[PDB]
Structure 1
Amino acid sequence: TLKYICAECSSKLSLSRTDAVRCKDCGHRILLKARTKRLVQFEAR
């Protein structure tokens, strides 16, 4: 499960090899990386 997000339409997005860095719904070049369920720990202080 590959996930980015476009900064314009907020449509979640995967990006394979030999692709343009563009969104597929809109034609937007800036495209930001989402976060997944991954463990980070914090001392509640």
Structure 2
Amino acid sequence: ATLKYICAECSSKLSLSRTDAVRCKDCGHRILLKARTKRLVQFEAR
């Protein structure tokens, strides 16, 4: 979705509160990436 970031194994949309926990709400599995930014970005193919 549009919210902040993702688990590793759960691969689930996860929004986190400021200083809440490093866990993922669903799985007990810890590490979490940061999902893609919705903001535009420019490349020049050449």
Is TM > 0.5 for Structure 1 vs Structure 2?
A: yes
Gaps of 5+ in 1: none
Q: Return the TM-score normalized by structure 2.
A: 0.79
> Is residue 5–residue 34 contact of structure 1 (8 Å, CA) maintained in 2?
yes
Gaps of 5+ in 2: none
CA-based RMSD: 1.4
Q: Return the TM-score normalized by structure 1.
A: 0.81
> Is residue 5–residue 32 contact of structure 2 (8 Å, CA) maintained in 1?
yes
The structure 1 segments of at least 4 consecutive aligned residues displaced by more than 2 Å after TM superposition are none
The 1-side partners of 2:19 and 2:37 are apart by: 24
What are the Cα deviations for residues 1-45 of structure 1, in whole angstroms up to 9, with x where unaligned? 531100011011011123110011111110010013211111111
Number of equivalences: 45
Q: Percent identity?
A: 100
